[PDB]
Design a binder for these strands. Structure first.
Lengths: 128, 339, 94, 313, 64, 357, 62, 128, 89
RNA sequence: CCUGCGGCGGCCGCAGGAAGAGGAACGGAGCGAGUCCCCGCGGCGCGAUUCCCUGAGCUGUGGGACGUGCACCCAGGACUCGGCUCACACAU
């Protein structure tokens, strides 16, 4: 995994060699606007009452007790989710240098296409 | 080579020793090599119930094929359910109450009235139902546990679903399928059903169907043979292999079968991990069960003392006078009568 | 009508001409069977029929009186019960 | 009737299946559209001159469909009368909404041990306030408002397979696979008559806008019987057909009661008051339906093999 | 009846709703055969079953 | 098959029985003639009711709040009557904390004064020669020293430092110290002796007496999850992996095994009469602390040793020990002191004066 | 917080201030997760933990 | 061979490769008249009272307890019998879609020549 | 006045001295340290090191002699401000 | 005099208790009766024109009509007895 062997034991399903790069670029073109969510404190309160979006999770956070309650929060309203390998790079793609564990992209302002593209492809990934 | 000896006498070598002297008797035999007159008077069969008839009927037929007088069963299946049913002949009837209350397993099929999204809407509505539930019985409302579940296969063209439920004695699977529908927003019913476990006995091993309970008896009657019948009936000492063992030695055995509480000078070997107020099985030196009784001393007390009560009998198995009365005749209790 | 009423729970999906509800009453009192359910402002809409689910957060469902529909009701509304007709959680536990 | 002009055909949606056939066709009680059922258990609705016809609505149903029926009134003057009722093998009675095509109500029927029983033959009342459906030995009588589990059972022969009402008096009739016709009162539930008849099992009934005449078919009985009610006697006449399978072969009248039409298992199409044949095509012809306003007709096709849809003038 | 099954590598029942296996052999019903308490053909069953060595008896003994 | 009579002697081998009743057969024996009763379980296999009445969590410490808060939380979750802890930790450090639940409380005082271990980070203002200096001069503080809270005396047995990084000027240390010690003030002196000026950045407590971290250390979410699990599923599986029984802390002492009738007296105020003694562990000396236990394996109290072993093999009557701290409830077993050979004589208004205590 | 660690051959904690191991795996934080006295997500944790055999009940006993 | 390796263990004797075909054709030319027997309920009761007919059996029925009593019923009165490979096809050759297990062909009406041909040929098949 | 302790080094604002009395006796908090020249050059903030021979830092009273003293010179204090080491053990 | 609990190293208040460490059959079993718990729109075979049926109505590894006979609806646990029977046993 281009030098990536430090995974959690709860990190299924993973992303493709490129499925992630696609998401990285989508996150980038979402950052240009105020159309994203950062940190557990904010995803947790947004996705409670309405707030439809799409969530990416880091794949090497320890201890796992920091965000174990998220996948089931997803299942209870039927959203999608997916794990990416590193948090060093998710922190970067967001526009900071301190890494993070969870991010949420939402339906865009205008173009919607790559967003709609990665939405409907992530919904058919092998059952965890 | 102690792993290979039969029921209730296997892996015996791993027990704590309290003495190693006594004088063997004549009476009794193993339960395996026990005679056919009574090897059928103390036995059970692991039946695979057929479809159309009731369950107070199947036993009624076994009570007219094998010519006996009493039978009992572990649970109760409604007509048009199949699967494991355990029946007991004569003597074994006295262990009915601890088979009527054990762990069960089923396998079912449910029909959803309207359509849903996919396989996952059902996997989750199943996950939701586990732990104590309420269930009104088809009388008052009551509570019953559920230990597990699963979703095996859904078919969307007909809307059929298969599942596997581990549960507690007294639940209902006809009512579970109403609910699994009523929250998914569409509706439901139970289509088929099949028990796959009762107590210790699975459907994986030692299972037979009524066309052998009627054929072995025919063969024995007409050609005086038994090798086809002692493959279909099994002895009591096979369905107790998870209780805790205590070995009494000879000349004590007839005492207990007359009713006298167990006493520490007679004990010969005891099993590690005994606790106060818990059922144990007291066995002879050849493997026969004498009774089920309630311990009164931990397994460490027993390693200190010299005398006194070590159980009180819950219910006794053996035939009153099988062994001969050898009691009142020892270093003490003989010297009490000299007074 | 009853003297007062208390909060029983919220509304969710309907199901074959009947409505399913989540129960959110104080403590974990559980209702009688065939007990009238009232609206907010003392109006009658039906009865309780089935009770299911886990021991703490259990659901229930209503059988409507004539004149009602599964379309009249909106998301997470609130229905109210006569408070005499509840039963303590205790007589259920050992 | 002079060899009706060939104005249209579907023969395009029934193509993706290995084997497939139709099981009737029915005009709305006003003229708007036509209702079709086929062997993949899917209902379709068509709307009223050189190209293939495509339907506005599809309904998926599941296992197998024993019947269907247009709501009693269905006048498109007002919206909330666009119903179509349906029955299946395990499922309950459904009521579909004929504009958007999403479910509106259900009408389940329960045993004497609380399991569910399906229905074999449903039919609405004249004033359209009740719904009658027929079971293994009985009929169950739901009301139209207040749906759910609430019957009013009436008892009795064998599976009741088709019901139909009288135009001008209180009365109704029930046919069964026990080869008998029962005539009962509309409100009470007394058998007012019980008449013998065919050789096979009954599969359709129909009335005449007079209120006197009365017509009925059968499953393998190669004939079609006429009756009367002013005279409580037995068949007055008899006609000829051919039927070598176990399916419904529909037939009908026209609004004023002058002409009758039948179907058959070779392809040809009877006419009577005896008149004309006019072959539709070459396969079996089940299901034949006449429009209530203008001269028009519709015929379906199909049979088991151990496939079209036409409109004529 | 709809329930079907087929054996695994380990020799336990795998339940399914289909009509063939992954490889393509058939699947047999789950439920057993009918029974009546007065049959008369007990002799016929034994000697045929004997002839091909699949009666209860000629199979290996269990481990008690 | 049958099991044969032989003639040779019989034996036990009890080198894996849980807690106290382990290597039981190596205690010297005195008598074996008595009557045992049917009250009071093994220490592990109690019902879940009274398994938590006497028990202790080896909690790991979160990072923001203060010890008193932690403890009140746990006491609210499990629905108990009162709790206390092993020794106060400050709101910015983490480590071991041995929370005793409601009857283990009776031996908190013996916990609070017990040797401890620490690991931490020192931040230096100005630079140094290098880590080999801090290495040499943390050896300077070994033994008995002064301190006052930021003028009491403390002592420190052993300490080492691990590794240093000159660029950010931070260092690591592990240390083993007495009870009550102020670790914060150790850094100040470290700086002053360094000649730069130190300060405390990070601190975590490794070991709190006998319970270390390598042992079954449990975090704080667990004590809520397990309680909920037992609450809704009726499963007690989880509840047992967190709470242990108090008899697990009392296990490097020496043992004295008593008779079932001379137990409900000691739980009121009475001495350790010589008659009521069954076995005793060789290796006792005078004026020590020992523990007295039942045949089953429950614990009665801890006490002071008067006679050595050599004396206690050979005697007529004596007095063996006197109480220090009592653990058990009062009326567990029934009370039976009014009876017996001598006491019957003495009550019948008879007195030779064979001897008095 | 700065403290880091990684486990040794006999499964005991080796503390350090770096960010990789002397072979190249990452290092885990020392301190535990934060806690609040009213959580409400206890069912979510157990449901997940069960599914991957990571719960404490399903590991070998000491 | 020919993709049928799912046979009972009690399926001797068999009908080879052309034998099956010939019997199939005989069956149909018998179906044209009222000269056949289908179903265990009917074969079992017909062959207890005379009825000098011929029996073919399916070769993949499970569980075997459903028709094990027939071969011996045959020996005791000296009729012939034989197993064909599939039951899907026996049901077909009869003129239905649902399979069956046992069929009994009898002497024909028009005194078919072929009916006597395979009667006389199956009576020399290797003893089972 | 008697010899208290001898200079070792200056750590930022303050120096460090090693208690080199005749008998191991410890001072009081905030005692003004003298030279042989009777004038207070500081007082004593704290003590540390082993109980047998301990270090103690002196704070300076005035801006005076931030860097005047040699790295082992002698300082003094009155003989009232001592106390016996026995009282601590 | 000793222990336990509490209040502010020690003092104070309240409560429990007077400690010689007993007993190698005291108190059972198997049955019977009574009160509670548990908890006949069916099932099997025969005769009748091959008794009808490959439905679209589940089903021929069966469905149904007409005459026909046959078998089943227990067994267990708790409490009480103002019952019968056998014992009253420390295991050479």
């Amino acid at each position: 995994q281009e030098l990536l062997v430090n995974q959690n034991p709860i990190a299924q399903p993973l992303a493709s060699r490129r499925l992630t790069r696609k998401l990285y670029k989508c996150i980038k073109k979402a950052v240009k606007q105020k159309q994203i969510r950062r940190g557990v404190k904010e995803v947790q309160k947004f996705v409670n009452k309405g707030e439809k979006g799409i969530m990416v999770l880091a794949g090497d956070t320890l201890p796992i007790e920091v965000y174990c309650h998220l996948p089931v929060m997803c299942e209870d309203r039927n959203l999608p989710y997916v794990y990416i390998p590193s948090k060093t790079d998710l922190g970067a793609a967001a526009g900071s240098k301190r890494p993070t564990c969870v991010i949420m992209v939402k339906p865009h302002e205008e173009y919607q296409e790559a967003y709609d593209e990665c939405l409907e492809e992530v919904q058919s990934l092998p059952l965890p | 080579d102690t792993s290979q000896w039969p029921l209730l006498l296997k892996n015996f070598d791993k027990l704590n020793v309290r003495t190693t002297h006594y004088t063997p008797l004549a009476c009794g035999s193993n339960p395996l090599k026990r005679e056919i007159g009574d090897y059928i008077r103390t036995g059970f069969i692991n039946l695979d119930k057929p479809s159309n008839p009731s369950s107070h009927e199947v036993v009624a037929w076994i009570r007219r094929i094998l010519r006996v007088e009493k039978t009992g069963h572990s649970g109760t299946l409604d007509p048009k359910v199949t699967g494991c049913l355990i029946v007991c002949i004569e003597r074994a009837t006295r262990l009915v109450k601890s088979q009527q209350s054990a762990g069960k397993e089923y396998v079912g099929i449910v029909r959803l009235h309207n359509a849903i999204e996919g396989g996952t809407q059902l996997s989750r509505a199943l996950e939701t139902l586990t732990g104590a539930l309420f269930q009104r019985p088809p009388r008052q409302l009551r509570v019953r546990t559920i230990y597990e579940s699963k979703m095996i296969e859904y078919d969307p063209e007909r809307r059929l679903g298969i599942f596997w439920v581990s549960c507690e004695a007294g639940t209902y699977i006809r009512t579970l399928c109403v609910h699994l529908g009523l929250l998914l927003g569409v509706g439901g019913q139970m289509q088929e059903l099949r028990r796959v476990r009762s107590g210790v006995m699975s459907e994986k091993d030692h299972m037979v169907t009524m066309h052998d309970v009627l054929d072995a008896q025919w063969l024995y009657d007409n050609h005086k043979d038994e090798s086809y019948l002692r493959r279909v009936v099994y002895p009591l000492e096979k369905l107790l292999t998870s209780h805790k063992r205590l070995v009494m030695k000879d000349s004590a055995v007839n005492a207990i079968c007359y009713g006298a509480k167990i006493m520490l000078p007679g004990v010969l070997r005891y099993e590690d991990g005994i606790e106060v107020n818990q059922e144990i099985v007291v066995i002879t030196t050849k493997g026969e069960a004498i009774c089920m009784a309630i311990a009164l001393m931990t397994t460490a007390v027993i390693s200190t003392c010299d005398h006194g009560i070590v159980a009180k009998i819950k219910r006794v198995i053996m035939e009153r006078d099988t062994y001969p009365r050898k009691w009142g005749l020892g270093p003490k209790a003989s010297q009490k009568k000299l007074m | 009508p009853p003297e007062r009423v208390v909060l029983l729970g919220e509304f969710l999906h309907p199901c074959e001409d009947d409505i399913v509800c989540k129960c959110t009453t104080d403590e974990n009192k559980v209702p009688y069977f065939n007990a009238p359910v009232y609206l907010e402002n003392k109006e009658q809409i039906g009865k309780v029929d089935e009770i299911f689910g886990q021991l703490r957060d259990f659901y229930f469902s209503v059988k409507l009186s004539e004149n009602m529909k599964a379309s009249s009701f909106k998301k997470l509304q609130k229905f109210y019960i006569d408070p005499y007709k509840l039963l303590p959680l205790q007589r259920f536990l050992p | 009737s002079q060899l009706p002009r060939f104005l249209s055909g579907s023969w395009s949606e029934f193509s993706t299946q290995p084997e497939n056939f139709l099981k009737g066709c029915k005009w709305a009680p006003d003229g708007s559209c036509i209702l079709t059922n086929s062997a993949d258990n899917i209902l379709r609705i068509y709307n009223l001159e050189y190209a293939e016809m495509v339907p506005v609505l599809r309904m998926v149903e599941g296992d197998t469909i024993y019947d269907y029926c247009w709501y009693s009134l269905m006048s498109s003057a007002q919206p909330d009368t666009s119903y179509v009722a349906s029955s299946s093998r395990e499922n309950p009675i459904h009521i579909w909404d004929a504009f958007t095509g999403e479910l509106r109500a259900s009408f389940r029927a329960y045993n004497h041990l609380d399991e569910l029983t399906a229905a074999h033959s449903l039919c609405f009342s004249p004033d359209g306030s009740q719904l009658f459906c027929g079971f293994n030995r009985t009929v169950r009588v739901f009301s139209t408002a207040r749906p759910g589990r609430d019957c009013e059972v009436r008892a009795t022969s064998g599976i009741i397979s088709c019901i139909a009402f009288s135009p001008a008096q209180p009365l109704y009739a029930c046919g069964s696979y026990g080869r008998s016709l029962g005539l009962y009162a509309w409100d009470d539930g007394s058998p007012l008559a019980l008449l013998g008849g065919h050789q096979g099992g009954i599969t359709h009934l129909c009335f005449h806008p007079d209120g006197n005449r009365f017509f009925s078919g059968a499953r393998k009985d190669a004939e079609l019987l006429c009756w009367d009610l002013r005279q409580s006697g037995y068949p007055l006449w008899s006609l000829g057909r051919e039927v070598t399978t176990n399916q419904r072969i529909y037939f009908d009248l026209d609004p004023t009661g002058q002409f009758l039409v039948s179907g058959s298992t070779s392809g040809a199409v009877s006419v009577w008051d005896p008149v004309l044949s006019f072959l539709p095509q070459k396969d079996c012809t089940n299901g034949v339906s006449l429009h209530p306003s203008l001269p028009l007709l519709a015929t379906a096709s199909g049979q088991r093999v151990f496939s079209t849809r036409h409109v004529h003038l | 009846m709809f329930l079907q099954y087929y054996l695994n590598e380990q020799g336990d029942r795998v339940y399914t709703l289909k009509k063939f296996d992954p490889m393509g052999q058939q699947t047999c019903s789950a439920h057993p055969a009918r029974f009546s308490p007065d049959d008369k053909y007990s002799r016929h069953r034994i000697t045929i079953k004997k002839r091909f060595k699949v009666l209860m008896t000629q199979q290996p003994r269990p481990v008690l």
